[PDB]
Amino acid sequence: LRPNAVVGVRLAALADQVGAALAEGPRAVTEDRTVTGVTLRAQDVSPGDLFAALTGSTTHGARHVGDAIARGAVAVLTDPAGVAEIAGRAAVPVLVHPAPRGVLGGLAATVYGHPSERLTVIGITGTSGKTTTTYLVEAGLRAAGRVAGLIGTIGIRVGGADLPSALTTPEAPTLQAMLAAMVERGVDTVVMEVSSHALALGRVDGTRFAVGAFTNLSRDHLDFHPSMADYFEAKASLFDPDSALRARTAVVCIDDDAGRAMAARAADAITVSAADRPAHWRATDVAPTDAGGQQFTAIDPAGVGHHIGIRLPGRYNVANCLVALAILDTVGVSPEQAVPGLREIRVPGRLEQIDRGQGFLALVDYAHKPEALRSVLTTLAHPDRRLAVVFGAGGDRDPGKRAPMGRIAAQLADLVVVTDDNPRDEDPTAIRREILAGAAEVGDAQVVEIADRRDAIRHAVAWARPGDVVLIAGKGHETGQRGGRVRPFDDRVELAAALEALER
Ligand SMILES: CC(=O)N[C@H]1[C@@H](OP(=O)(O)OP(=O)(O)OC[C@H]2O[C@@H](n3ccc(=O)[nH]c3=O)[C@H](O)[C@@H]2O)O[C@H](CO)[C@@H](O)[C@@H]1O[C@H](C)C(=O)N[C@@H](C)C(=O)N[C@H](CCC(=O)O)C(=O)O
Ligand SMILES: [Mg+2]
């Protein structure tokens, strides 16, 4: 996804815009060169690109200048540390800026012709539910017959094409190029996951958001953000009226202390509640249905109810759908127009129910981490049925997560099966042991250890009873099993297979 019809911008114009210094000083050559693309990865440069040589946690892009020059880069944008790495002559103009990353987004939006002013870009932020919400919006938009584009963790979707992505939210130069390509392909609306990383690090800097939405907040990403406050503030970038990143219109789920705080921040948010608080949109008559679905009445700000049906379980997925409906409405798609696409979309690995022919509920979920697991389980237990859950943790990752995670599983599940999720270099048994240490403390559950992930799934399936619910957690859409080798593995495929192998 790169556009193929970008007119350039003179290098000297860019230099002026961002007030950059030249590494070689007073260039005439700069007045001559044209910039037709922007990238911050040397190996991605196409001839005519500006290479942003950035500093980062693990290296400095200026060390890759030689490579960029050889792939055709017309010029380089870096900081004072960058000039130090380059030492003397690079064969192209080197623009120096303190804080390049804080200005990259605008440069990219300049060269790709400000694609986001020619599109309706919807950004969705929050701790959980970003993916699911972007999926519902994109589903509604399709049903109304709009040409939509989706950008998030599972990948990028435009028209007939679907392609993968390194990050929940791409870096500025990629994002701007994607949006430019979408413009060429005649997309008119784009939904996006906007992570708090992306906001903190300037990834969305040159982008006009027509709608910004907030799902919720609970503790996550504290290995990046120095505190919970900082985490909230990063997200606020999208809602504060005076903020450079304020979206044109704000949709904010209450239901959450953090949610309630964001509404106030936005000052004029369209508010959304599935938990019986007054809001512009509310949910009533929430009923579960056969085939693991949910139906409710969504009441718009005019106070008119709409019959919504959705393939996803859980109260918070009702909240996701309300956010979707609020977004869709402000962008000119009514519930009536939207509902055929919501009735039937499945979001990969987010409470994705797998049905290879009846019996009981079988679901795959992304939920790793203590908090995510607690809510997933709670919204799946009904006094009756029986709830089984297979999971494990990743090797060479903070172990602190393992201990209570099994504890959560112990109080809420009826059957808990501990297996291997990406062990890497770490010894598999040491990982499972620590989770099981949590499963001790059990007056309810029944805990097992089956190392082999495949047999674990097999075990829980054969254990079910018509009406029971099985949950494979901790991978969602993400594949493979790392142990050297990446053994093939897709949680959705085995499980569909395990169900396939069940009877004469
Ligand atoms: C911590 C973080 O935000 N990391 C991202 C960031 O890394 P960095 O600044 O530390 O880069 P580092 O390798 O020093 O590289 C230095 C610079 O030299 C450049 N370089 C480097 C090597 C090379 O061969 N050629 C080259 O040009 C790099 O592009 C980079 O500009 O920029 C790199 C290039 O864009 C990304 O690969 C990297 O994403 C890594 C994979 C990552 O794990 N990011 C996570 C933390 C992240 O972004 N997470 C959120 C998800 C949260 C959620 O989904 O809930 C997201 O929005 O994706
Ligand atoms: Mg997150």
Swiss-Prot record:
A motif (Meso-diaminopimelate recognition motif) lies at residues 421-424. Pfam families: Mur_ligase (PF01225), Mur_ligase_C (PF02875), Mur_ligase_M (PF08245). Carboxylation is probably crucial for Mg(2+) binding and, consequently, for the gamma-phosphate positioning of ATP. Its main location: cytoplasm. ATP binds at residues 126-132. Its EC number is 6.3.2.13. It catalyses: UDP-N-acetyl-alpha-D-muramoyl-L-alanyl-D-glutamate + meso-2,6-diaminopimelate + ATP = UDP-N-acetyl-alpha-D-muramoyl-L-alanyl-gamma-D-glutamyl-meso-2,6-diaminopimelate + ADP + phosphate + H(+). This is UDP-N-acetylmuramoyl-L-alanyl-D-glutamate--2,6-diaminopimelate ligase. It is found in: Cytoplasm. One of its GO terms (biological process) is cell division. The modification N6-carboxylysine is found at residue 235.
